Structure 1
Amino acid sequence: GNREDRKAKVIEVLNKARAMELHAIHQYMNQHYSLDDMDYGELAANMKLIAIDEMRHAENFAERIKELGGEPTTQKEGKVVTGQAVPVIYESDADQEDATIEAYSQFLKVCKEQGDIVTARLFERIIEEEQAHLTYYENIGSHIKNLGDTYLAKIAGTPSSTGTASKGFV
């Protein structure tokens, strides 16, 4: 395609990815709110830290969309599922991460076909992070299935802190 054609094709997959991150942020934070309510500290903390990774993916996608002359979407891709039980959280989060990695690896092929090396590299780095998320969700899911409440009894009452309060305006 011409210069504009290529930019538009990449801005499209970037916005698709961004909508996926916007979904994960609301989905993972919903789950964090449940986990925190159950007082499963370590689990709630790590869920919020992964959601913050997704916020940063969302931001990186938007920044690159701006670099290419586009407008960052404000809509999340899909619907947020609430009230999930603990076994369901980790099962569905692992599935979701695996799907994202499949999706982003195709998005990557698009960028390479449209000759956009900078965007392809963004996708490669974020796919490596999604892999870290997948592995985490799978490990929790497997202990829960194999060890049940014995494992959860260990997590009950642990600290849920994610560190010092974040940089804000006030």
Structure 2
Amino acid sequence: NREDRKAKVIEVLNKARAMELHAIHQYMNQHYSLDDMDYGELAANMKLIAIDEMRHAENFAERIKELGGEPTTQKEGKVVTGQAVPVIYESDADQEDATIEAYSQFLKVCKEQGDIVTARLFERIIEEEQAHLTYYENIGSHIKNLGDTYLAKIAGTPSSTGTASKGFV
């Protein structure tokens, strides 16, 4: 029925959302490390990708409300900390790839439940995850093939991501 159709879509939406919450904390944790290491452009792009995941989490939450459900506040999995630079980019590529696989499954569920608006949302976000995927693979390729010679170039670059957060104060 209509109610079961919505509940099944809400379920994959909250699963995706929980994955987004995990990515936000995982990438920001890496952001703090790269920043601490003073690899500015890497620090900045890692934070800009975290913000894309924040935006995904919010979009998933808004559709869940539209369907009458509650947006989860729990993250899926655990954040891995203290990763060395090569492990950061190899693991983040792995995560992006597994995310696209899972969201492609969630998309299918939306289509089966005849939910056109939610399947389109997954499709749009999956394209953005593909851009994250390509970025992490590329950095990993340079670390693998060029090592510290590549990092020497990143050392001390600007880490800014733009004007500060439009906020309340």
TM-score range, shorter chain: over 0.9
Give the CA deviation at 1:117. Answer: 0.2
Q: Deviations over 1:48-86 (max 9, x none)?
A: 000000000000000000000000000000000000000
Q: Deviations over 1:13-70 (max 9, x none)?
A: 0000000000000000000000000000000000000000000000000000000000
| Counterpart Cα distance in 1 of 2:83 and 2:64 | 33
Give the CA deviation at 1:101. Answer: 0.1
| Counterpart Cα distance in 1 of 2:141 and 2:89 | 9
Matched length:
169
Q: Deviations over 1:76-115 (max 9, x none)?
A: 0000000000000000000000000000000000000000
| Counterpart Cα distance in 2 of 1:14 and 1:114 | 13
Give the CA deviation at 1:156. Answer: 0.2
| Counterpart Cα distance in 1 of 2:139 and 2:121 | 28
| Counterpart Cα distance in 2 of 1:133 and 1:37 | 22
Query: Any gaps of 5 or more consecutive residues in structure 2?
Result: none
Structure 2 partner of 1:154: 153
> What SS class does the counterpart of residue 80 from structure 2 fall into?
coil
| Counterpart Cα distance in 1 of 2:154 and 2:91 | 20
Q: Give the share of equivalent positions with the same residue, in percent.
A: 100
Structure 1 partner of 2:94: 95
| Counterpart Cα distance in 1 of 2:150 and 2:24 | 26
Query: Any gaps of 5 or more consecutive residues in structure 1?
Result: none
Structure 2 partner of 1:142: 141
> What SS class does the counterpart of residue 159 from structure 1 fall into?
coil
Give the CA deviation at 1:146. Answer: 0.3
**Aligned-pair Cα RMSD in Å:** 0.2
> What SS class does the counterpart of residue 73 from structure 2 fall into?
coil
Give the CA deviation at 1:148. Answer: 0.2
Give the CA deviation at 1:152. Answer: 0.2
Q: Which runs of 4+ in 1 moved over 4 A?
A: none
